[PDB]
Structure 1
């Protein structure tokens, strides 16, 4: 049902996708160790925001690892090209994984925005429901990326509505609670918003690849877009969230945070 299954791949195409996914694994698990070691310099009220980045690194790292092994399982070099064998490859499992990873990305944002108690629970709940609506409708949509492009587009439109509303909740909370943020991170959090807008928008672009480039090079392009988007939305984003957590910790008087920033 996926466009990947339609084509044979050159040695170059096949190996490049393998390298993309493998590099993705390495970057996330390398970043994982970074978040782990810096977590001790984060104040208790923010420390979970850094822990969530560890959770995202392993979650994303495992899905990229799984995709890479699926890639090599599904294809074999036969008569001059990589051809589909008995096992299958699908991006569908990425969608399933977003059901967990996207709430984690949103939660760590709410934490450094200094949301607490009732407002935190209610905001998280609405955000997660919006994200799940986006993901599920998008998942349904890509089931038709070969059979029914018109249906892919309509489900994509519904998904985009959830996307836009989710982003509106995010923007509203960010620009409202920006003033509560310490150590100059009121400025930094604005860049985080724009980073999210940019990085997350790459995913619906990848979703539409079967509509504007239905060929083997389109398959490569989609994996390339996922790679850019994954690294930007999880790793670079996580680094900014953790930076914001540490800076606010230091400004709140947390001594390990103050000492850590002093060494650099």
Structure 2
């Protein structure tokens, strides 16, 4: 709960264990809860869960291996991310907008997403410089993302849409912003300062961001979909 000072095997182990435990817990819960989800969301959870599940597992493995030695094939994480971004988004918006027809959000996410990956890939290729400025490029892209998103055609479909769709959308944007905004928040804590520049904090923070950007994604989407659809309190 705060600090930032652990040996290699120390931090590596703590995170590794936390990831394994969390991953499993989220897997068993999300799996068993697969039957405790809204009916109309049957396909929503199928496409969203399939893409989110494959990306999470893949990315997770890649990340772990990357920090394991220090060098790994980014081509996998790049293509996976670029293949999961438009997939998870398009699908999610597909079934979500399916209530009326289709969601144009795919276009917005396509442009923004492409740009983000472009910078991360181009700069990441050398990793010489981009962590510091990452706050700028990211901030701008983030603001613009929600800026136009806030006016999405979602509610434009009919007028005020349904309470379920509005709940899932609002919660989705909220998490996306928080998480995406947290990435740079923690990274900076280990980018310039930390303890001389330990790769540990880098891997951990990275895995944490991708973990919540994948796990939490389905956790919230499902929680809001199940809570809105028809469910009672109890945790």
> Which whole-Å CA distance do the structure 2 matches of 1:139 and 1:208 have between them?
19
Q: Does residue 182 of structure 2 align to residue 202 of structure 1?
A: yes
1:172 equivalent to 2:155? Answer: no
Seen in structure 2, the aligned counterparts of structure 1 residues 125 and 135 have a Cα distance that, compared at 3 Å, is same
Give the secondary-structure state (helix, strand or coil) at the position aligned to 1:241.
helix
Give the corresponding residue for 1:68.
Answer: 64
Q: Residues of 2 paired with 1:62 and 1:22: CA distance?
A: 17
- Which residues of structure 1 form unaligned runs of 5+? 1-9, 75-83, 251-260
- Structure with max Cα Rg: 1
Q: How many angstroms does 1:50 deviate by?
A: 1.7
TM-score (norm 2): 0.70
Moved more, 88-97 or 129-138: 88-97
Query: Is the contact made by 1:141 and 1:152 (CA closer than 8 Å) also made in structure 2?
Result: no
Unaligned runs of 5+ in 2: none
Determine which of 19, 23, 28 is the counterpart of 2:23: 28
SS at 1:45 equivalent: coil
Q: What's the secondary structure of 1:173's corresponding residue?
A: coil
Q: Is the 8 A contact 2:37 2:225 kept in 1?
A: yes
Deviation at 1:197, TM superposition (A): 0.9
Query: Is the 1:127–1:169 contact (alpha carbons within 8 Å) kept by the matching residues of 2?
Result: no
CA 1:34–1:210: 2 relative to 1, 3 Å: closer
Using the alignment, how far apart are the partners of 1:136 and 1:49 within structure 2?
A: 28
CA distance in 2, matches of 1:222, 1:165: 27
The structure with the greater share of residues assigned to helix is 1
CA contact (8 A) 2:59 2:210 kept: no
How far apart, in 2, do the equivalents of 1:93 and 1:166 lie?
A: 26
Residue matched to 1:13: 8
Which residue number corresponds to residue 112 of structure 2? Answer: 130
- Cα 1:112–1:242 shift into 2, 3 Å: farther
Written as runs of structure 1 = structure 2, the 5 A alignment for 1:67-216 is: 67-72=63-68, 74=69, 88-89=71-72, 93-107=76-90, 110=93, 114=97, 116=99, 119-120=102-103, 122-146=104-128, 149=129, 157-158=136-137, 161-173=140-152, 176=155, 179-182=160-163, 186=166, 189-205=169-185, 212-213=192-193
Q: Deviations over 1:229-257 (max 9, x none)?
A: 2343222231221122224444xxxxxxx
Q: Name 2:214's counterpart in structure 1.
A: 234
Q: Is the 8 A contact 1:53 1:234 kept in 2?
A: no
Residue 80 of structure 1 aligns with which residue?
none
Compared with structure 1, are the counterparts of its residues 210 and 34 closer, same or farther at alpha carbon in structure 2 (3 Å cutoff)?
closer
TM (norm. structure 1) is 0.64
Question: What does residue 79 of structure 1 align with?
Answer: none
Given the superposition, is the C-alpha separation of residues 231 and 67 from structure 1 closer, same or farther in structure 2, using an over 3 Å criterion? closer
| Higher RCO (CA < 8 A, seq sep 6+) | 2
Query: Considering only aligned residues, what root-mean-square deviation do their CA atoms show, in Å?
Result: 3.9
Q: CA deviation at 1:162?
A: 4.0
